[PDB]
Ligand binder design. Structure first.
Ligand SMILES: Cc1cc(NCC(O)(C(F)(F)F)C(F)(F)F)c2cnn(-c3cccc(C(=O)N[C@H](C)C(N)=O)c3)c2c1
Ligand SMILES: CCCCCCO[C@@H]1O[C@H](CO)[C@@H](O)[C@H](O)[C@H]1O
Lengths: 250, 11
């Protein structure tokens, strides 16, 4: 049928491997213990995301300072969305951070846990409600990498707008290809892009927690270096007002 | 900048 590669079929092969937390269950659970593990896992998956971003067709051709800016802005968007997807795919209202670390019903009632997890659980339920397919998911995660740019703009701003539009169309092609009522396609396209818009609020919540945790001196929790500099670099920006959130629907 | 981020992107 097709011996030349589609864009979605490439996004499939470059989709990062699912990583392990290295969380020891035998020892009793603890919030501090989970906090520390998720910081570390978060570091390794952002590294995974960099590798992934490079292999996204078009992304390499952007300027390096642009490639860096997009990962600096989008890392939590990607983690939030991939976490929502895996949770939706492995079951109940349970966040599946890794095979060896699931925030089960019991863990959900640990102190402070639900106050943060509710945001990620929202993403999970939305994917369930909408019955998002895998190809739709891959186009949507690709579009989240491209969900923020600096107010002043990128150095390769035009190439960025081309790339983004391509993956908007690629999301369009995903919906049409999905099994079901083709009469619903345009509505579904409205719905799915409305979900991508709603990720800004989710991420804004997650980042404020992450930063507050990072800047708490009485806290004393370990962050991985890669991730720690990204947080150190980004905190000034998110306070000032130098970021422009790309919306699908005003 | 973040030297390691830059490195991973470039090589
Ligand atoms: C939302 C979220 C938060 C996390 N930790 C938060 C946090 O500890 C804290 F500080 F609390 F906010 C850290 F890290 F410091 F910010 C993690 C850790 N792991 N995950 C995760 C799970 C599954 C998939 C992915 C993910 O991004 N995978 C995609 C495919 C890829 N890799 O490109 C990522 C996380 C997802
Ligand atoms: C997103 C990963 C879940 C974060 C776990 C909750 O984390 C926390 O819970 C404690 C108890 O309420 C708070 O005292 C602490 O300041 C807060 O960081």
């Amino acid at each position: 049928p097709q011996l030349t590669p589609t864009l979605v079929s490439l996004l499939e092969v470059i989709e990062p491997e699912v990583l392990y937390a290295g969380y020891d269950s035998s020892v009793p659970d603890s919030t501090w213990r989970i906090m520390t593990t998720l910081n570390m896992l978060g570091g390794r998956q952002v590294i995974a995301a960099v590798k992934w971003a490079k292999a996204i067709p078009g992304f390499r051709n952007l300027h390096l300072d642009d490639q860096m800016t997009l990962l600096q802005y989008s890392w939590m968007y990607l983690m939030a969305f991939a976490l929502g997807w895996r949770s939706y795919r492995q079951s109940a209202n349970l966040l599946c951070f890794a095979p060896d670390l699931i925030i089960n019903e019991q863990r959900m009632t640990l102190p402070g846990m639900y106050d943060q997890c509710k945001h990620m659980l929202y993403v999970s339920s939305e994917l369930h409600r909408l019955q998002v397919s895998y190809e739709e998911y891959l186009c949507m995660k690709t579009l989240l990498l491209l969900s923020s740019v600096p107010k002043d703009g990128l150095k390769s701003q035009e190439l960025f707008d081309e790339i983004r539009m391509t993956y908007i169309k690629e999301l369009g092609k995903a919906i049409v290809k999905r099994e079901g009522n083709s009469s619903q396609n345009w509505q579904r396209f409205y719905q799915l892009t409305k979900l991508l818009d709603s990720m800004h609020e989710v991420v804004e919540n997650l980042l404020n927690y992450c930063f507050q945790t990072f800047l708490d001196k009485t806290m004393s929790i370990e962050f991985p270096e890669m991730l720690a500099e990204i947080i150190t670099n980004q905190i000034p920006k998110y306070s000032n007002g130098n970021i422009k959130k790309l919306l699908f629907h005003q | 900048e973040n030297a390691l981020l830059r490195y991973l992107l470039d090589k």
